[PDB]
């Protein structure tokens, strides 16, 4: 399940992936992820998010993040949303986050966890390494934020199954 998460980063780009197993059915987890206009639903770093019009390919949301972070704003563009295959692709097109040409692929797959309905979520990305940082630093920084967001998605999904 990395036909969707295989990347060819250039020499001055870095790529990685993070995964998370969620004790909730895929339909519930995907219904959270699909809501492109409300990332605050499971991302604790988001304090507001605006996007004009309906959710469609090419839609752009303007994300404001809370205090205690290196960035404050981020402009992100919906590249792919497959509601049948549960694939969400986003591209960063602005913001003070220093993550340029950031492209990411999120997929959610069915799994049995402890005999009950579960979910595997995988988010991979490619991004330019900004000058003055290493590939190991850029990956570690992005993975840490993605890991916190997937853990919060797991908590949100599992406390809506109760």
């Amino acid at each position: 399940v990395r036909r969707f998460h295989r990347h060819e980063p250039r020499d001055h780009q870095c790529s990685s992936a993070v995964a998370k197993h969620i004790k909730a059915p895929v339909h519930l987890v995907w219904s959270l992820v699909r809501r492109f206009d409300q990332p605050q639903l499971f991302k604790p770093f988001v304090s507001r998010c605006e996007m004009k019009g309906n959710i469609e390919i090419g839609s752009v949301r303007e994300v404001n993040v809370k205090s205690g972070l290196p960035a404050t704003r981020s402009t992100e563009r919906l590249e792919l949303l497959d509601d049948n295959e549960h694939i969400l692709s986003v591209r960063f097109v602005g913001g003070d986050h220093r993550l340029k040409n950031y492209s990411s692929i999120l997929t959610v797959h069915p799994e049995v966890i402890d005999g009950r309905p579960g979910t595997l979520v995988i988010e991979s990305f490619v991004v330019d390494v900004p000058e003055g940082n290493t590939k190991d630093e850029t990956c570690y920084f992005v993975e840490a934020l993605l890991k916190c967001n997937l853990k919060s998605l797991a908590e949100v999904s599992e406390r809506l199954v109760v």
Binding site: K66, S67, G68, D96, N133, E137, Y140, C148, K151
Partner: protein, 299 residues
């Protein structure tokens, strides 16, 4: 008995996540932490029974939200007082131990690892989300000593008599002993608009932020300073002030605002409140975009 002022504001910031505390006579300190057994034994006053009242001042710069800073204002002095009262039943080591166990207990309460009292019932869930945290710089002020415990990038500065002298060092990730501790645990300190743990948090020590665990710890840094007939004032402030005002700049202004109130004129104290108000507005006029919180304690 204590003489202080306190000023705080959003500033240009969207939301207010700073908090402060000023608790007079919050506890009684066992004097064996403030005087040699043999210097009090010379007066026949064995310090194992003596205690002296003390006042608690604290500033708590929250991030990710204000719920953790507000919790520190409500809870840290209560936990400190219960900790002092039982210790009475090397003194530098003892000060570090009572402050370390107090900060750890509050951190464990914030993160939901231990239960907390609310009424007579108990709550065990975390106080708020995983990304919410707060600095904590507290000043224990009694007649003989000022005891400072610092956790984060807030700062307390003493004016004695014209020097600023820093009673706390900012817990920035690039700071050498902090970077070494973080990397020894397999972590990383990354420059990403400033040096940050995992490239995210601009501090290596705080209350809360359970998602940056075990790299961001609640261990406070303690400094015991005896009061010498020379001190002017204490200045506790979030980095909203220290980002645009230096230790020299803040000390000379606070010490002068106190003097100009008493030559012009005869809860908070008006002269010290004027110093805190002036320092807050001064930071506003020098281009500070953060929350501002200033406590001035007239010694």
């Amino acid at each position: 008995a204590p003489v202080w002022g306190c000023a705080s504001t959003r500033g240009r910031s969207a939301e207010m996540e700073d908090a402060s505390a000023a608790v007079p006579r919050f506890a009684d300190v066992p004097v064996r932490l403030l005087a040699s057994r043999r210097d009090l034994d010379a007066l026949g006053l064995d310090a194992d029974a003596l205690r002296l009242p003390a006042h608690l001042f604290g500033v708590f710069d929250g991030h990710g939200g204000a719920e953790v800073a507000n919790y520190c204002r409500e809870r840290i002095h209560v936990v400190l007082s219960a900790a002092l009262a039982r210790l009475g039943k090397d003194m530098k080591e003892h000060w570090d131990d009572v402050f370390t166990k107090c900060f750890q207990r509050v951190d464990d309460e914030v993160s939901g690892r231990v239960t907390r009292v609310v009424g007579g019932e108990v709550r065990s869930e975390p106080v708020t989300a995983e990304n919410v945290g707060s600095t904590a710089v507290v000043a224990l002020v009694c007649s003989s000593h000022v005891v400072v415990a610092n956790c984060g990038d807030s700062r307390i500065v003493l004016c004695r008599g014209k020097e600023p002298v820093a009673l706390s060092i900012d817990h920035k990730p690039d700071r050498k002993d902090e970077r070494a501790r973080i990397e020894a645990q397999g972590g990383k300190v990354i420059q990403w608009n400033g040096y940050r743990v995992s490239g995210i948090l601009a501090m290596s020590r705080s209350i809360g932020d359970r998602y940056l665990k075990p790299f961001v710890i609640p261990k406070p840094e303690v400094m015991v300073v005896p009061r010498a007939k020379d001190d002017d004032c204490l200045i506790l402030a979030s980095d909203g002030l220290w980002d645009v005002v230096s230790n020299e700049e803040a000390c000379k202004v606070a010490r002068r605002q106190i003097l100009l109130w008493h030559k012009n004129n005869g809860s908070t104290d008006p002269a010290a409140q004027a110093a805190a108000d002036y320092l807050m507005r001064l930071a506003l006029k020098k281009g500070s975009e953060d929350n501002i919180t200033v406590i001035v304690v007239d010694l």
